[model samples]
Target: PLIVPYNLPLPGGVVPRMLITILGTVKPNANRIALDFQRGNDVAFHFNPRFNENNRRVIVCNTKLDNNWGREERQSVFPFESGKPFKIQVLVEPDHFKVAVNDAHLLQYNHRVKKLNEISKLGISGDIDLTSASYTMI
Candidate 1:
């Protein structure tokens, strides 16, 4: 997915949850998917949404993935400013998922579910927009 940070800025530690509908039918028991992007140190993706109780921003989801469930999980760090646009891509492969933000930084995540190929659906629900998003098979 692509985001124009002009009006909507994604800062560090600001976890945004989104629903993404897959273009292809993912097989059951698929190990992991890769997350790719055009810029680095700008944006990130989380299985869960960050709730803002004060602002009343509540995100609904069934499952959530933390930031430390893979090998390069801690290595993926995004520190971006407002008004700057960037791209974030997620590639869900068989064994592990690679997350590339802005084509500069990268992160990896292990498979959480045993049936790694059973994921044939994609739904994003959080802060980011899905209109400027794009994806490709690995």
Candidate 2:
């Protein structure tokens, strides 16, 4: 069982043509889950899916720099549901990261940190159980 709040040192810092895949199941009463790409203490990218917020479901993405969070990019494509399994993919490109859920395109998050190669950690946390998580340098 993959532990919650898991942090993995990126094998080779993010670069163009890289793919990240995560498989997990949301708990029956899950409220939120977060995935982060970090450069030391800074969050280069924050992928968050909220199961419940103001009686609504949404996906929020953001970046944190110097201990402060930037503006949020929220999307109401609530592809995930409680007690269900999911497959998430993050494709790193020159200027953005393309995200997909269960093989369907979701959103693209523009690069905020600029120095992609400096992002050395991948973090997972919140109300989900990860079955698998991996990256490919393709």
Candidate 3:
């Protein structure tokens, strides 16, 4: 299994018409997980899944500029399950990111960090066994 808290460099950076894909299985006792697109210390996009937060299950999406986090976007239609493998795809659009989990559309996050090409890394953290992560253009 790939190691946790991983970082992958984006050689050409991100652009519209690109798709970021991740495959992983949540740990049996997982509480939270995060996938991020970052530019140095600034997070262009933050995808966080919290299994238990104040007794609610939700996925939080946000951005960080100058190391300060923006308002969070919490989604309630959780698709993740402990011990189950999941496929996540993020479509990079000109104005927003369209996300799909386990083959179904999940949510759309509008651009917060407008310079897409400035994001040079993909980061993963939290409780999960990461199997694979990649990006493609379609």
Candidate 4:
């Protein structure tokens, strides 16, 4: 997913235990960007790397319900760099999404919805420009 705006429907959707890879950079002074994996109108996983709120050096996890954002999982350590690139791998389990950033254990987000395969959309949106992305949805 190297194209500009790099947003699209997740090919074939994601089943339980699926793992996907995302590669991108943080624009200089970027506030945040997200790898949003979801179902219709409901976000199951918000893989978000937030900045400026930087005193904490953390990643924020959350879900959207009925198009309204709620239920944040906060304070996971941040491994992002402004204007610097990063690599990520995410494994979706029945209970949680396990994440690895830059070859290190980074974070975990619990399931907001139990049916993993229904997550038909994979959104790549943030202030930063994306370089490359490849995902394997099992």
Runs of candidate 2 exceeding 4 Å displacement: none
At residue 32, what lDDT does model 2 achieve? Answer: 97
Model 2, C-alpha of 76: deviation from truth (Å): 0.6
lDDT winner:
2
Worst lDDT 10-window in candidate 1: 6-15
Once model 3 is optimally superposed onto the true structure by TM-score, how far is the C-alpha of residue 95 displaced, in angstroms? 0.6
* Candidate 2 residue-wise lDDT, 71-105, digit = tens: 99999988998999999999999989999999999
**For candidate 3, lDDT tens digit of each residue in 22-125?**
99999998899999999889999999999999988899999998878989998999999989999999999999989999999999999988888988899999
**Model 1 RMSD in angstroms:** 14.5
TM-score of 3: 0.97
Q: State model 2's lDDT.
A: 0.92
Superior by lDDT: candidate 3 or candidate 4: 3
Regions of model 1 farther than 4 Å from truth = 1-76
lDDT by residue (tens digit), candidate 1, 79-134: 22222343555555555445455665345556444343334333333333334543
The candidate 4 region of ten consecutive residues with least summed lDDT is 1-10
Worst-scoring 10-residue span by lDDT in model 2: 3-12
TM-score of each: 0.42, 0.97, 0.97, 0.86
lDDT, residue 10, candidate 1: 24
For model 4, residues 37-69, the per-residue Cα lDDT tens digits are: 888878888877778674655678888889889
Candidate 3's displacement at residue 90, Å, is: 0.8
